[PDB]
Amino acid sequence: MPKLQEMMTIVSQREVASNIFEMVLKGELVEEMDLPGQFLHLAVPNASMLLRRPISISSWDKVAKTCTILYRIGDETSGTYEISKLQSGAKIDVMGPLGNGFPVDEVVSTDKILIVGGGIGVPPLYELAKQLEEKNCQMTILLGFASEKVKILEKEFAELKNVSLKIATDDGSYGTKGHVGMLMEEIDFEVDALYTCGAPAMLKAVAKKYEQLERLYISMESRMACGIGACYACVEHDKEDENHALKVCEDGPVFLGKQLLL
Amino acid sequence: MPKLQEMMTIVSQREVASNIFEMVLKGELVEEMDLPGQFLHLAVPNASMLLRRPISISSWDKVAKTCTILYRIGDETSGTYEISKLQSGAKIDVMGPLGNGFPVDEVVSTDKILIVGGGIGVPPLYELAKQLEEKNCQMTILLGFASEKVKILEKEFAELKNVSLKIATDDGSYGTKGHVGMLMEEIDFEVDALYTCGAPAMLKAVAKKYEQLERLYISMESRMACGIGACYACVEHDKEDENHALKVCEDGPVFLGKQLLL
Amino acid sequence: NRLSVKLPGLDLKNPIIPASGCFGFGEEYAKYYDLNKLGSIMVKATTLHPRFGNPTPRVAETASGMLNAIGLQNPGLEVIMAEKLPWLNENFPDLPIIANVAGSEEDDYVAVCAKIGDAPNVKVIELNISCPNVKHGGQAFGTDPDVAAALVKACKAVSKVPLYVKLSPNVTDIVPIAKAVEAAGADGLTMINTLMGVRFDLKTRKPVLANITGGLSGPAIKPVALKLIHQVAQVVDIPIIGMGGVESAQDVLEMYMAGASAVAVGTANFADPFVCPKIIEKLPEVMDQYGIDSLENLIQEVKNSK
Amino acid sequence: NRLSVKLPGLDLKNPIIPASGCFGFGEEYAKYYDLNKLGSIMVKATTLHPRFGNPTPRVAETASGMLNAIGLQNPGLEVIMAEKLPWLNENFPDLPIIANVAGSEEDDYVAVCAKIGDAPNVKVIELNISCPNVKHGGQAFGTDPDVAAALVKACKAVSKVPLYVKLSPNVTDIVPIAKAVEAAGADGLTMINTLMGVRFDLKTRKPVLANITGGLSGPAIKPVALKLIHQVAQVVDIPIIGMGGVESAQDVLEMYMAGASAVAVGTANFADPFVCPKIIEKLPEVMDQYGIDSLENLIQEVKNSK
Ligand SMILES: Cc1cc2nc3c(=O)[nH]c(=O)nc-3n(C[C@H](O)[C@H](O)[C@H](O)COP(=O)(O)OP(=O)(O)OC[C@H]3O[C@@H](n4cnc5c(N)ncnc54)[C@H](O)[C@@H]3O)c2cc1C
Ligand SMILES: Cc1cc2nc3c(=O)[nH]c(=O)nc-3n(C[C@H](O)[C@H](O)[C@H](O)COP(=O)(O)OP(=O)(O)OC[C@H]3O[C@@H](n4cnc5c(N)ncnc54)[C@H](O)[C@@H]3O)c2cc1C
Ligand SMILES: Cc1cc2nc3c(=O)[nH]c(=O)nc-3n(C[C@H](O)[C@H](O)[C@H](O)COP(=O)(O)O)c2cc1C
Ligand SMILES: Cc1cc2nc3c(=O)[nH]c(=O)nc-3n(C[C@H](O)[C@H](O)[C@H](O)COP(=O)(O)O)c2cc1C
Ligand SMILES: O=C(O)c1cc(=O)[nH]c(=O)[nH]1
Ligand SMILES: O=C(O)c1cc(=O)[nH]c(=O)[nH]1
Ligand code: FES
Ligand code: FES
Ligand SMILES: [Cl-]
Ligand SMILES: [Cl-]
């Protein structure tokens, strides 16, 4: 009970976009998952790389006992690169699930949900749309990527009903040319809750457009070491209590917008 | 041509005695092998362990394109332990063949060959007996082990003809109770060439018993780094030229007894 | 039992102590196992006033190591005495706590050392003299035997519990500093704190740590720790709590061959949260493998070898 | 070309230089690839008289590193001038050789530096001041700015080729020593030599190296090298040949962000004999990945950042 750590089995792994791998993991950590937007602290199969790699949960299947993640790799000296060389059947050392995810309890079919995502911020937003869809609320999902080469999870989002999905690319290679913020300006309704995740400039633009909204949930990143809140590596300044540090791994990864300064 | 290094394929690996693994490797390094008693410089599949592990060649099969090695592992923090976790199909990073092996050219069916081996000194002596057997000389092979638990290559030596094979164990659990040196005293003939390999006390006792014999070939060990003679880690004092260093990886691993001080 | 070791201020059920800065005040890892398994805990550094720490990024990976530039983030003396240590005392009344004490000037160290022994569960103080001194131009107290001996002597006067000094490894010669610190009244030593490293981002060409430089730790530094622990052990009679890159019972035992009496484990907890209980249950089998009686014996056999 | 860098005494076709003690005099690795691919070679230390070196075991593995205690084994000046360097000159007449010079007292260093420039292929001398001085009690020349500046100044007088000094990292503050060495007339610097480590045998309880202590190298020390290279680069104008744990073109480029002009690769050759040609053919693709012009530019962009 509350396992915290487990040698999970890779069900599969394939490269679903340019340098972005989708890994499906089987183990008993999945029964512990609840809120969308928690993450896993993955150990690299490389004894010289001791710090775990933190990667958002994209979706899970409680009955199948599997969860799904989508991550970008670095160059051949990077540790995520090594993770992609693992193959079906291999075990991988996982801590999780970890963090405070996206709240979905107080959402009901009348309020209108906006979801903004970019880059490798998209994966954790997919499980979010799954669990929100069961509340029969109306969703607008705007995703932005650098290029068509790095577009991920389009078919999975399209298949969800109650979804108006728009996709931008910075170069115009797919969908709307430009950044996700441009599509954000173009929405015409009163949003009741916004969930967002992506590169800091995108989070900065989202938080400034909706500074007035209480139900604005922002998913953050930082450099990590311990992953459970003891080493204080991943701090953010608390906007609500100055001099007080928020910890992205334990207090986060998702915060209300009142708590952050960008 | 002269490949020097290769990613070989493990044909198989099994634990043939207590903590002693036999690995059969397939690759084109095998066509380069000639004298018995050369070694391979193996890389550990563990990026934190940069120094290669040097392991004698036990035997090879030129047509099958495979060679065989037999090595002892340390504890779970040891690098050889990691090598034993590799499995059939895996590739392993090999430098070789390396060193000066056992000379066998000038041997002819009339001279009587004595072979002394102990512990994990035994493996390279097996290929030696194979190549000497084709010269139809008469062989006496005396092997000593700590225990029955660590006895290796008995069935392979027994199957060679022109062989009188005796086996000792320090505890008496198999064959003759005691050390290989006891069986060594008990030989009654004039030995023309002696080949030996094993723990330093055993090599010390062998060299002192036959200090008078020119054709006495001793296989040595030392701590290694480069494996090709550049870093000077593995030196022995040259007995024939004082102040001059012999290098176990390049000048050795096998020397004439005149060249060594124990 | 075999694993028990007795030190000044420390009746340890076994020698494993999570290292300062790597365990907070135990509240997080406690969700993962019963802290009573541990011998002790070096809690995070306490400074007199609260400190947010350095700007991020604060950590970076290296080969068999990591860099940290936390900056001594901690809630300060008053909060640590009122919340963090009492919390340990309630949930683990019999678990001895090692109070890492850091500072920016001598008065601050002394002020902390006057109060922090009042906590019932704090049995020892670990003087972290591996900080910058503003009363000296940002020079580290741990690089000048005279100042360091001043600091220890000043702090020795106000402390109700035994005082260990934590040595910095970034020295040319470490022997003058240990001799000086032992003669200033230190009851023990811990070593080592971190070495100094830097990583650069290939994309931005700037250091990856905001602080530019950061402390290097992990198995990469175990040889440096062993060498300086062995060096100091030939020069002082006060016992040494060794640390630096320990990840295994083997590593613990090697620290003993160097002259350590207990072993602190720091960076390793980040890779394996259970590494400290894991090592403790693995220690007796590994001691049998190498014919070792008890750790109390080994300390004496090594001390007499030496 | 992109990879070419020009230094005092050094017109390098690219920046990769096998580090001293890790390449002998090139005769062994030459069986594995055409040495002309290299930018240069720091050959093994030359001392005035022959030296057998230290007793074995001389090396030991560490986490992402190794320990060595070779003891400056080398055939001495007369043999090196007559056999080892002429051999390089015949097989590689256009391949510039960096002559590591070590010693036990000042006269010995000077005597070597007087003769060894006479070799046509020796373009630079790398003063290895990371040795013990018997004219001072076994203290290292590399820890006293006054002595080190004496040694360099004495050696600067007799040398027919530019003189680089190789800095030891085992210092509290490295800045006084580089300032002193640059003011003594050094044309360049190489850094770093090794850190100091120890390993213990669990079975015998004795150090695994006969010499007890040994030099730590490999990727474990790359952060320490980067930090001291960055530290010194803000303090001197003479160029720096950086080394310490380099294994990749990425590692080479990071040395450039620290302020190095060429990169020496030492311990890595033992794991991968082809690592130095491997890195050289891999460098341009990696420079494109991070938008880098030429190494000559990068030296200037980094120098001006700084
Ligand atoms: C809460 C959280 C969730 C995340 N989810 C995802 C995801 O779902 N998909 C995905 O592709 N990426 C995700 N990231 C970013 C991801 O952790 C980095 O891509 C990855 O750790 C980089 O390591 P590496 O092996 O690629 O590179 P290396 O350069 O070998 O990593 C070295 C060290 O630097 C750290 N590091 C370097 N860049 C980053 C970065 N941008 N963010 C965090 N740490 C970094 C690594 O964690 C590691 O500790 C997430 C980050 C956080 C904090
Ligand atoms: C020429 C030669 C041939 C050899 N052939 C064989 C063989 O056929 N079978 C076999 O079982 N063993 C052989 N050995 C010994 C073998 O290399 C060691 O058993 C092995 O390297 C130990 O490393 P490890 O990963 O087990 O332990 P670790 O303790 O993890 O090794 C750490 C470092 O210490 C070195 N080391 C430790 N003990 C020894 C030792 N006794 N000899 C050499 N290096 C050591 C390792 O090489 C490595 O560089 C040979 C040694 C030499 C020099
Ligand atoms: C993230 C981090 C924070 C640390 N914080 C402290 C601290 O507050 N006080 C202190 O004395 N040492 C601190 N250290 C040093 C450790 O206590 C430990 O002595 C050092 O890291 C070496 O051991 P290790 O390699 O097992 O971590 C810290 C180390 C790390 C990695
Ligand atoms: C086996 C060995 C021998 C060495 N011999 C020398 C030497 O003779 N002279 C010298 O200046 N440095 C010597 N060094 C230090 C290296 O030149 C190099 O600067 C140091 O090892 C750091 O780089 P690396 O980590 O890539 O090896 C030696 C290092 C090793 C590992
Ligand atoms: O808080 C820190 O940054 C810190 C303190 C210390 O003593 N050692 C360390 O490595 N980091
Ligand atoms: O020869 C050696 O032992 C040696 C010399 C040197 O300068 N550096 C080193 O690490 N080892
Ligand atoms: S990663 Fe250690 S505190 Fe967040
Ligand atoms: S191992 Fe490098 S010289 Fe023999
Ligand atoms: Cl303070
Ligand atoms: Cl000399």
PDB file of C-alpha atoms in Angstrom, chain D residues 80-253:
ATOM      1  CA  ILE D  80      63.852  10.402 -24.819  1.00  0.00           C
ATOM      2  CA  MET D  81      65.878  12.778 -26.997  1.00  0.00           C
ATOM      3  CA  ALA D  82      67.559   9.892 -28.842  1.00  0.00           C
ATOM      4  CA  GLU D  83      64.820   7.282 -29.279  1.00  0.00           C
ATOM      5  CA  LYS D  84      61.299   8.334 -28.357  1.00  0.00           C
ATOM      6  CA  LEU D  85      60.974  11.823 -29.866  1.00  0.00           C
ATOM      7  CA  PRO D  86      63.007  11.055 -33.023  1.00  0.00           C
ATOM      8  CA  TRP D  87      60.650   8.127 -33.533  1.00  0.00           C
ATOM      9  CA  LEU D  88      57.735  10.572 -33.528  1.00  0.00           C
ATOM     10  CA  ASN D  89      59.672  12.898 -35.815  1.00  0.00           C
ATOM     11  CA  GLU D  90      60.224  10.214 -38.465  1.00  0.00           C
ATOM     12  CA  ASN D  91      56.714   8.817 -38.538  1.00  0.00           C
ATOM     13  CA  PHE D  92      54.963  12.168 -37.943  1.00  0.00           C
ATOM     14  CA  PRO D  93      57.296  15.057 -38.899  1.00  0.00           C
ATOM     15  CA  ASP D  94      54.448  17.625 -39.053  1.00  0.00           C
ATOM     16  CA  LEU D  95      52.719  16.529 -35.810  1.00  0.00           C
ATOM     17  CA  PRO D  96      53.580  19.034 -33.041  1.00  0.00           C
ATOM     18  CA  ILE D  97      54.694  17.428 -29.777  1.00  0.00           C
ATOM     19  CA  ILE D  98      54.075  18.834 -26.298  1.00  0.00           C
ATOM     20  CA  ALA D  99      56.905  17.774 -23.979  1.00  0.00           C
ATOM     21  CA  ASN D 100      55.739  17.254 -20.412  1.00  0.00           C
ATOM     22  CA  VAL D 101      58.672  18.060 -18.113  1.00  0.00           C
ATOM     23  CA  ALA D 102      58.693  16.856 -14.489  1.00  0.00           C
ATOM     24  CA  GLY D 103      61.375  16.908 -11.847  1.00  0.00           C
ATOM     25  CA  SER D 104      62.397  16.647  -8.225  1.00  0.00           C
ATOM     26  CA  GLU D 105      64.278  19.940  -7.855  1.00  0.00           C
ATOM     27  CA  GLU D 106      64.631  23.190  -9.784  1.00  0.00           C
ATOM     28  CA  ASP D 107      67.984  22.339 -11.430  1.00  0.00           C
ATOM     29  CA  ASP D 108      66.508  19.164 -12.929  1.00  0.00           C
ATOM     30  CA  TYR D 109      63.569  20.983 -14.535  1.00  0.00           C
ATOM     31  CA  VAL D 110      65.950  23.596 -15.958  1.00  0.00           C
ATOM     32  CA  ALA D 111      68.386  20.985 -17.269  1.00  0.00           C
ATOM     33  CA  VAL D 112      65.573  19.201 -19.144  1.00  0.00           C
ATOM     34  CA  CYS D 113      64.132  22.484 -20.506  1.00  0.00           C
ATOM     35  CA  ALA D 114      67.569  23.456 -21.826  1.00  0.00           C
ATOM     36  CA  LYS D 115      67.937  20.349 -24.002  1.00  0.00           C
ATOM     37  CA  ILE D 116      64.471  19.192 -24.922  1.00  0.00           C
ATOM     38  CA  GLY D 117      63.585  22.052 -27.268  1.00  0.00           C
ATOM     39  CA  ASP D 118      66.430  20.813 -29.492  1.00  0.00           C
ATOM     40  CA  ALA D 119      64.069  18.135 -30.755  1.00  0.00           C
ATOM     41  CA  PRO D 120      62.653  19.470 -34.075  1.00  0.00           C
ATOM     42  CA  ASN D 121      59.146  18.185 -33.359  1.00  0.00           C
ATOM     43  CA  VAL D 122      58.865  19.550 -29.785  1.00  0.00           C
ATOM     44  CA  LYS D 123      57.038  22.867 -30.216  1.00  0.00           C
ATOM     45  CA  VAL D 124      55.971  23.464 -26.600  1.00  0.00           C
ATOM     46  CA  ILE D 125      57.021  22.424 -23.099  1.00  0.00           C
ATOM     47  CA  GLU D 126      54.344  21.604 -20.514  1.00  0.00           C
ATOM     48  CA  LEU D 127      55.878  22.229 -17.087  1.00  0.00           C
ATOM     49  CA  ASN D 128      54.430  19.622 -14.750  1.00  0.00           C
ATOM     50  CA  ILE D 129      54.806  21.452 -11.431  1.00  0.00           C
ATOM     51  CA  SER D 130      52.500  18.860  -9.813  1.00  0.00           C
ATOM     52  CA  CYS D 131      55.446  16.842  -8.308  1.00  0.00           C
ATOM     53  CA  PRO D 132      57.134  16.741  -4.870  1.00  0.00           C
ATOM     54  CA  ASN D 133      60.065  19.129  -4.226  1.00  0.00           C
ATOM     55  CA  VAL D 134      62.842  17.616  -2.055  1.00  0.00           C
ATOM     56  CA  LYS D 135      64.543  21.085  -1.814  1.00  0.00           C
ATOM     57  CA  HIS D 136      61.364  21.962   0.239  1.00  0.00           C
ATOM     58  CA  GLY D 137      60.288  18.788   2.095  1.00  0.00           C
ATOM     59  CA  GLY D 138      58.200  17.034  -0.532  1.00  0.00           C
ATOM     60  CA  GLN D 139      55.916  20.048  -0.933  1.00  0.00           C
ATOM     61  CA  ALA D 140      54.546  20.459  -4.463  1.00  0.00           C
ATOM     62  CA  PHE D 141      55.960  23.299  -6.610  1.00  0.00           C
ATOM     63  CA  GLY D 142      52.340  23.864  -7.673  1.00  0.00           C
ATOM     64  CA  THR D 143      51.130  25.019  -4.246  1.00  0.00           C
ATOM     65  CA  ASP D 144      53.502  27.966  -3.588  1.00  0.00           C
ATOM     66  CA  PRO D 145      53.260  30.927  -5.992  1.00  0.00           C
ATOM     67  CA  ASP D 146      56.740  32.139  -5.044  1.00  0.00           C
ATOM     68  CA  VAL D 147      58.523  28.831  -5.662  1.00  0.00           C
ATOM     69  CA  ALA D 148      56.439  28.088  -8.745  1.00  0.00           C
ATOM     70  CA  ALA D 149      57.267  31.510 -10.150  1.00  0.00           C
ATOM     71  CA  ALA D 150      60.937  30.872  -9.343  1.00  0.00           C
ATOM     72  CA  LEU D 151      60.786  27.516 -11.140  1.00  0.00           C
ATOM     73  CA  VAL D 152      59.091  28.960 -14.214  1.00  0.00           C
ATOM     74  CA  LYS D 153      61.415  31.954 -14.367  1.00  0.00           C
ATOM     75  CA  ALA D 154      64.486  29.729 -14.067  1.00  0.00           C
ATOM     76  CA  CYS D 155      63.110  27.401 -16.767  1.00  0.00           C
ATOM     77  CA  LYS D 156      61.927  30.299 -18.963  1.00  0.00           C
ATOM     78  CA  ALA D 157      65.566  31.396 -19.338  1.00  0.00           C
ATOM     79  CA  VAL D 158      66.905  28.219 -21.004  1.00  0.00           C
ATOM     80  CA  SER D 159      63.993  27.200 -23.269  1.00  0.00           C
ATOM     81  CA  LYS D 160      64.096  27.571 -27.051  1.00  0.00           C
ATOM     82  CA  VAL D 161      60.278  26.998 -27.256  1.00  0.00           C
ATOM     83  CA  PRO D 162      57.195  28.429 -25.509  1.00  0.00           C
ATOM     84  CA  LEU D 163      56.566  27.306 -21.940  1.00  0.00           C
ATOM     85  CA  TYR D 164      53.124  26.238 -20.645  1.00  0.00           C
ATOM     86  CA  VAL D 165      52.546  25.457 -16.967  1.00  0.00           C
ATOM     87  CA  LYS D 166      50.241  22.605 -15.878  1.00  0.00           C
ATOM     88  CA  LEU D 167      48.279  23.576 -12.789  1.00  0.00           C
ATOM     89  CA  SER D 168      47.446  21.347  -9.903  1.00  0.00           C
ATOM     90  CA  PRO D 169      43.803  21.452  -8.694  1.00  0.00           C
ATOM     91  CA  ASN D 170      44.632  20.473  -5.100  1.00  0.00           C
ATOM     92  CA  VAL D 171      44.676  24.083  -3.909  1.00  0.00           C
ATOM     93  CA  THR D 172      42.563  26.275  -1.670  1.00  0.00           C
ATOM     94  CA  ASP D 173      42.831  29.250  -4.044  1.00  0.00           C
ATOM     95  CA  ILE D 174      44.269  28.728  -7.516  1.00  0.00           C
ATOM     96  CA  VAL D 175      44.254  32.390  -8.586  1.00  0.00           C
ATOM     97  CA  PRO D 176      47.499  33.509  -6.867  1.00  0.00           C
ATOM     98  CA  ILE D 177      49.385  30.659  -8.619  1.00  0.00           C
ATOM     99  CA  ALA D 178      48.155  31.449 -12.093  1.00  0.00           C
ATOM    100  CA  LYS D 179      48.798  35.191 -11.676  1.00  0.00           C
ATOM    101  CA  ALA D 180      52.295  34.367 -10.435  1.00  0.00           C
ATOM    102  CA  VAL D 181      52.996  31.868 -13.242  1.00  0.00           C
ATOM    103  CA  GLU D 182      51.756  34.219 -15.959  1.00  0.00           C
ATOM    104  CA  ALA D 183      53.996  36.992 -14.578  1.00  0.00           C
ATOM    105  CA  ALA D 184      56.958  34.604 -14.605  1.00  0.00           C
ATOM    106  CA  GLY D 185      56.787  34.371 -18.390  1.00  0.00           C
ATOM    107  CA  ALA D 186      54.590  31.358 -19.128  1.00  0.00           C
ATOM    108  CA  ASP D 187      53.148  31.496 -22.649  1.00  0.00           C
ATOM    109  CA  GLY D 188      50.163  29.289 -21.769  1.00  0.00           C
ATOM    110  CA  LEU D 189      48.543  27.072 -19.176  1.00  0.00           C
ATOM    111  CA  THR D 190      47.244  23.554 -19.094  1.00  0.00           C
ATOM    112  CA  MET D 191      44.818  22.449 -16.391  1.00  0.00           C
ATOM    113  CA  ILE D 192      44.075  20.339 -14.711  1.00  0.00           C
ATOM    114  CA  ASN D 193      46.301  17.613 -13.416  1.00  0.00           C
ATOM    115  CA  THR D 194      44.669  15.057 -11.129  1.00  0.00           C
ATOM    116  CA  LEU D 195      42.939  15.334  -7.765  1.00  0.00           C
ATOM    117  CA  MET D 196      44.006  13.109  -4.850  1.00  0.00           C
ATOM    118  CA  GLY D 197      42.062   9.976  -3.956  1.00  0.00           C
ATOM    119  CA  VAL D 198      42.408   6.686  -2.104  1.00  0.00           C
ATOM    120  CA  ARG D 199      40.776   3.260  -2.411  1.00  0.00           C
ATOM    121  CA  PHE D 200      40.786   0.568   0.287  1.00  0.00           C
ATOM    122  CA  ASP D 201      40.632  -3.185  -0.222  1.00  0.00           C
ATOM    123  CA  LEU D 202      37.796  -4.628   1.816  1.00  0.00           C
ATOM    124  CA  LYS D 203      39.611  -7.974   2.122  1.00  0.00           C
ATOM    125  CA  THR D 204      43.079  -6.788   3.206  1.00  0.00           C
ATOM    126  CA  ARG D 205      41.952  -3.435   4.715  1.00  0.00           C
ATOM    127  CA  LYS D 206      44.980  -1.786   3.137  1.00  0.00           C
ATOM    128  CA  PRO D 207      44.973   0.851   0.374  1.00  0.00           C
ATOM    129  CA  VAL D 208      44.650  -0.758  -3.020  1.00  0.00           C
ATOM    130  CA  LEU D 209      47.445   1.421  -4.443  1.00  0.00           C
ATOM    131  CA  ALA D 210      50.928   0.674  -3.155  1.00  0.00           C
ATOM    132  CA  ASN D 211      51.485   4.410  -3.037  1.00  0.00           C
ATOM    133  CA  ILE D 212      48.344   4.721  -0.817  1.00  0.00           C
ATOM    134  CA  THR D 213      47.313   7.988  -2.504  1.00  0.00           C
ATOM    135  CA  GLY D 214      46.885   8.415  -6.238  1.00  0.00           C
ATOM    136  CA  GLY D 215      45.714  10.835  -8.875  1.00  0.00           C
ATOM    137  CA  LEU D 216      41.978  10.910  -9.597  1.00  0.00           C
ATOM    138  CA  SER D 217      40.887  11.504 -13.206  1.00  0.00           C
ATOM    139  CA  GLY D 218      38.084  10.713 -15.613  1.00  0.00           C
ATOM    140  CA  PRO D 219      34.594  12.234 -16.035  1.00  0.00           C
ATOM    141  CA  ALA D 220      34.234  12.359 -12.264  1.00  0.00           C
ATOM    142  CA  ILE D 221      36.542  15.408 -12.247  1.00  0.00           C
ATOM    143  CA  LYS D 222      35.108  17.339 -15.222  1.00  0.00           C
ATOM    144  CA  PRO D 223      33.119  19.720 -12.964  1.00  0.00           C
ATOM    145  CA  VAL D 224      36.231  20.491 -10.905  1.00  0.00           C
ATOM    146  CA  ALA D 225      38.227  21.099 -14.086  1.00  0.00           C
ATOM    147  CA  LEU D 226      35.546  23.369 -15.533  1.00  0.00           C
ATOM    148  CA  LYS D 227      35.341  25.405 -12.320  1.00  0.00           C
ATOM    149  CA  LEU D 228      39.080  25.997 -12.059  1.00  0.00           C
ATOM    150  CA  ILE D 229      39.437  26.653 -15.795  1.00  0.00           C
ATOM    151  CA  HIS D 230      36.619  29.206 -15.573  1.00  0.00           C
ATOM    152  CA  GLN D 231      38.212  30.717 -12.418  1.00  0.00           C
ATOM    153  CA  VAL D 232      41.667  31.121 -13.946  1.00  0.00           C
ATOM    154  CA  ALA D 233      40.386  32.337 -17.341  1.00  0.00           C
ATOM    155  CA  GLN D 234      39.059  35.521 -15.632  1.00  0.00           C
ATOM    156  CA  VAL D 235      42.530  36.287 -14.262  1.00  0.00           C
ATOM    157  CA  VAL D 236      45.100  35.630 -17.020  1.00  0.00           C
ATOM    158  CA  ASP D 237      45.457  36.524 -20.688  1.00  0.00           C
ATOM    159  CA  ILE D 238      47.618  33.565 -21.766  1.00  0.00           C
ATOM    160  CA  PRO D 239      45.546  30.795 -23.381  1.00  0.00           C
ATOM    161  CA  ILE D 240      44.526  27.646 -21.520  1.00  0.00           C
ATOM    162  CA  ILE D 241      44.645  24.047 -22.710  1.00  0.00           C
ATOM    163  CA  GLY D 242      41.858  22.450 -20.673  1.00  0.00           C
ATOM    164  CA  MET D 243      41.653  18.834 -19.579  1.00  0.00           C
ATOM    165  CA  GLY D 244      39.899  16.721 -16.966  1.00  0.00           C
ATOM    166  CA  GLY D 245      37.412  14.004 -17.759  1.00  0.00           C
ATOM    167  CA  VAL D 246      36.784  14.934 -21.378  1.00  0.00           C
ATOM    168  CA  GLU D 247      35.106  12.078 -23.242  1.00  0.00           C
ATOM    169  CA  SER D 248      32.969  13.744 -25.952  1.00  0.00           C
ATOM    170  CA  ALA D 249      32.782  16.535 -28.487  1.00  0.00           C
ATOM    171  CA  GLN D 250      30.136  17.949 -26.119  1.00  0.00           C
ATOM    172  CA  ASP D 251      32.741  17.835 -23.348  1.00  0.00           C
ATOM    173  CA  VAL D 252      35.249  19.582 -25.631  1.00  0.00           C
ATOM    174  CA  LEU D 253      32.783  22.365 -26.423  1.00  0.00           C
TER     175      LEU D 253
END
